[PDB]
């Protein structure tokens, strides 16, 4: 929900650790059109 | 590669990635029904579908 997004050539990098990742909120977003996962099952993110 | 590669891209072949449960051995699934995420009903392309 960041107001400003960085450019493609200057993509911002953030590190997330030592917390619980809630993917239900990620699924709850409506304007999401393209969602591709490689190597893992998208529905198993809450378990892995 | 020299039999099943097209310069524009081979979209004739597909794989299934979204389904409620894993397949038991030697089971064939051919349905193209949309996938539902969570409990919200799905009627077409969009969120959770
Ligand atoms: C951008 O990354 C920096 C660290 O490089 C971080 O402090 C900041 O919160 C990030 N901003 C966004 C909007 O993700
Ligand atoms: C056979 O069909 C039933 C009813 O649709 C379904 O529940 C089951 O998973 C199918 N089994 C296999 C091995 O395809």
Briefly say what this structure is:
The structure is cut from a larger assembly and holds 2 copies of chain A. Chain A is low in regular secondary structure.
Structural category of chain A = little secondary structure
How many helix segments of chain A? 1
Q: How many beta strands in the DSSP annotation of chain A? A: 0
The SSE order of chain A reads: H
- Report the C-alpha radius of gyration of chain A, rounded: 13 Å
- Estimate percent helicity of chain A: 10-25%
Bound molecules: 2-acetamido-2-deoxy-beta-D-glucopyranose
Oligomer: part of a larger assembly
Shape of chain A: extended
> Which two protein chains have the largest interface (Cβ within 8 Å of the partner's Cβ), and how many residues from each?
A-B, 9 and 7 residues
Protein name (chain A): Spike protein S1
Glycosylation sites (chain A): 1
Structural overview:
Chain B: This is Spike protein S1. The structure is cut from a larger assembly and holds two copies of chain A. Chain A starts with about 20 loop residues before the first helix and ends in a 20-residue tail after the last helix. The first copy, chain A, has one helix and no strands. Chain A has one helix at about 25-30. The complex binds 2-acetamido-2-deoxy-beta-D-glucopyranose (2 copies). One 2-acetamido-2-deoxy-beta-D-glucopyranose binds near residues 12, 13 and 14 of chain A. One 2-acetamido-2-deoxy-beta-D-glucopyranose binds near residues 2, 12 and 14 of chain A.
